[PDB]
Curated annotation (Swiss-Prot):
Name of the gene this protein is made from: Pck1
Species annotation: Rattus norvegicus
Subcellular localization, as worded in the UniProt entry: Cytoplasm, Cytosol; Endoplasmic reticulum
Positions of substrate binding: R85, Y233, G234, G235, S284, N401, S402, R403
Name under which the protein is recorded: Phosphoenolpyruvate carboxykinase, cytosolic [GTP]
Cited Pfam families: PEPCK_GTP (PF00821), PEPCK_N (PF17297)
């Protein structure tokens, strides 16, 4: 069927067979092979041997180091220019801008970044032609969600990064079995390049191929494509995670009647064995992973982890909100993780785990700020910047957004239904972020509509998960500001529409604040395992216990309803204080934000809830 060789890159296939692929997967591979011009094509099978060999190969080349203190753990140090997400270089392409983001009155949108089809094609042509010269194109078949779940979705990621291949094996279900399950079905098309064709034009910093100048993370939902160039950092290069499972999936979810959210999923069991599942949306680096696998301090209580980051949720024909974790692993913030703060994480990351931008001890272990493990005298530390480090120095040993990438199956409290194809029934949804002032430890929304407004109103101190520096309290509706796949106003309408659904059992909505501080900047709440005390209250409220007092912002715990045994030094009045002054200002600021950023796309119900909150506050 050809006058010469065709577009047949069969000669360059070094694992698997293009003939073995489904026809559409083959076209995707060969088309991009012709564009990117890789030397070889490696069709990933996801096997232990493939993984081990690829890791040793990376080890040979000085791309990673083996951590000799642990069972099969590895360390990658990056170019300091490629350390986190970059929201300003993250774009969604649609025919109309307004389908992607509301048109902001003030001229600049805080809700996503749109690029025209025409501008994107120019950006694409300035980057990808020949970009994989001298490198292997890896073909990664992956499933988001358990294989054969009705809620699961398959993708194919093309990459020239062995680091991406290894990390995808942990964070997704990856390999031959995914291709077999896929058959001739549709798949999300994911294209990635580090953007450093050989021979190299500039020298690599720290053996980490990247192209910060041309870095662009693009989403084309109408073509079912994700196209990411120039960054190896996980959020930008593990295309199943933020790019697919939040951005693409949120819009699909809108179209099909389900939800794709930046939420942990956990099971909480009381001392008498009664169990419920909760979902929680906190902004990046605001405590989801610590909550999802919390070691509860309250005797008798148990927490089990379903997922720590992304939730796909859909009301079943019985009206239960069913959640699955679409990921296969945890891509968790390293700094702060200790036996004290997160004992279950520490046990998970003992083996089969890839660390990125943490420090290395002289005995082949890992180190970071807040690890809370003294080292023997004589043990020295290499920083994430590959230099000798002392606790003297005014510079952290690990990068603030350094990460572990670890299999979810190893979590000692992984929930028994964490791969159930039907999902787990959600009875409560928790919103929250970092608020140093004004917002009490916990409150409960008055209705679904108020609950959606509470999600929409979320604000949170900036973190190191993206490019944002300092401690400015930013707006982060639903913890989804960096991740909306479409118009935020339409997303709110979609959320509100859940109330009108066949027999839907709407979860109770809560808002929490672990991060309230006193005059001296000291946390008023110790948090971590002590947050079990907040979860107890939520549990009883879902059961219908009369443990709530009505305030202007919603229901708070009655006096003595929170179990504070073992925490008698906690200042309850300060922690739970609601100031008319603060809240007048808060509502005014929410008003102006929504009017500016959402305007004509703002649902009536949300504006109504705003008007109601304002009125309730005026009566204080
Ligand atoms: N003070 C306090 N700090 C916390 C608490 N929970 C988590 N943290 C810290 O906040 C940082 C980020 O927490 P994570 O649980 O990794 O945040 P995340 O929501 O999983 O972030 P992403 O994975 O980026 O979406 C870590 O350094 C934690 O130690 C808490 O209850 N109280
Ligand atoms: O990496 C993450 O999970 C994030 O940035 O939210
Ligand atoms: Mn996240
Ligand atoms: Mn996390
Ligand atoms: Na390196």
């Amino acid at each position: 069927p050809q006058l010469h060789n065709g577009l047949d890159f069969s000669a360059k296939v070094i694992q698997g067979s293009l003939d073995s692929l489904p026809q559409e997967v083959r076209k995707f591979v060969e088309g991009n092979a012709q564009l990117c011009q890789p030397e070889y094509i490696h069709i990933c099978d996801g096997s232990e041997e493939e993984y081990g060999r690829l890791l040793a190969h990376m080890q040979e080349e000085g791309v990673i180091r083996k951590l000799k203190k642990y069972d099969n753990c590895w360390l990658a140090l990056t170019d300091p220019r490629d350390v986190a997400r970059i929201e300003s270089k993250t774009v969604i392409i649609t025919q109309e801008q307004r389908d992607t983001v509301p048109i902001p009155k003030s001229g600049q949108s805080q809700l996503g970044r749109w690029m025209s089809e025409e501008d994107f094609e120019k950006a694409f042509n300035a980057r990808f032609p020949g970009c994989m010269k001298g490198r292997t194109m890896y073909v990664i078949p992956f499933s988001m969600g358990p294989l054969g779940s009705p809620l699961a979705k398959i993708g194919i990621e093309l990459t020239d990064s062995p680091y991406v291949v290894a990390s995808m094996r942990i964070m997704t279900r990856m390999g031959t079995s995914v291709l077999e399950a896929l058959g001739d079905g549709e798949f999300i098309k994911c294209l990635h390049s580090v953007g450093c064709p050989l021979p190299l034009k500039k020298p690599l910093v720290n053996n980490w191929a990247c192209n910060p100048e041309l870095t662009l993370i693009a989403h084309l939902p109408d073509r079912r494509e994700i196209i990411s160039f120039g960054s190896g950092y996980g959020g930008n290069s593990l295309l199943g995670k933020k790019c697919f499972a939040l951005r693409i999936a949120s819009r699909l979810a809108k179209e099909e009647g389900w939800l794709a959210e930046h939420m942990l999923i956990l099971g909480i069991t009381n001392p008498e064995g009664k169990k419920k599942y909760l979902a929680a949306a906190f902004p990046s680096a605001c405590g989801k992973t610590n909550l999802a696998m919390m070691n509860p301090t309250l005797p008798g209580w148990k927490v089990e982890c379903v997922g720590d980051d992304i939730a796909w949720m859909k009301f079943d024909a019985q009206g239960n909100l069913r959640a699955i974790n679409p990921e296969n692993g945890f891509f968790g913030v390293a700094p702060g993780t200790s036996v004290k703060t997160n004992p279950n994480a520490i046990k998970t990351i003992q083996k089969n785990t890839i660390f990125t931008n943490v420090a290395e001890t002289s005995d082949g272990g890992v180190y970071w700020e807040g690890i809370d493990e003294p080292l023997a005298p004589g043990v020295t530390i290499t920083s994430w910047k590959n230099k000798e480090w002392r606790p003297q120095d005014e510079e952290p040993c690990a990068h603030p957004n350094s990460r572990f990438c670890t299999p979810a199956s190893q979590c000692p409290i992984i929930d028994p239904a964490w791969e159930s194809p039907e999902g787990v029934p959600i009875e409560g949804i928790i919103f929250g972020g970092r608020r140093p002032a004004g917002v009490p430890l916990v409150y409960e929304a008055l209705s679904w509509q108020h609950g959606v407004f509470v999600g929409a109103a979320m604000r949170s101190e900036a973190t190191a998960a993206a490019e944002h520096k300092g401690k400015v309290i930013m707006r982060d509706p639903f913890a989804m500001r960096p991740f909306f796949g479409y118009n935020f106003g339409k997303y709110l309408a979609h959320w509100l529409s859940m109330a009108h659904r066949p027999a839907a059992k709407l979860p109770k909505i809560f808002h929490v604040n672990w991060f309230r501080k006193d005059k001296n900047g000291k946390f008023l709440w110790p948090g971590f395992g002590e947050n079990s005390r907040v979860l107890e209250w939520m549990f009883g409220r879902i059961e219908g216990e009369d443990s709530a007092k009505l305030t202007p912002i919603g229901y708070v715990p009655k006096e003595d309803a929170l179990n504070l045994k073992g925490l008698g030094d906690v200042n309850v009045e300060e922690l739970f204080g609601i100031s008319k002054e603060f809240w007048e200002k808060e509502v005014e600021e929410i008003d102006k934000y929504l009017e500016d950023q959402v305007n004509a796309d703002l649902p009536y119900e949300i504006e109504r809830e705003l008007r109601a909150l304002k009125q309730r506050i005026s009566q204080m």
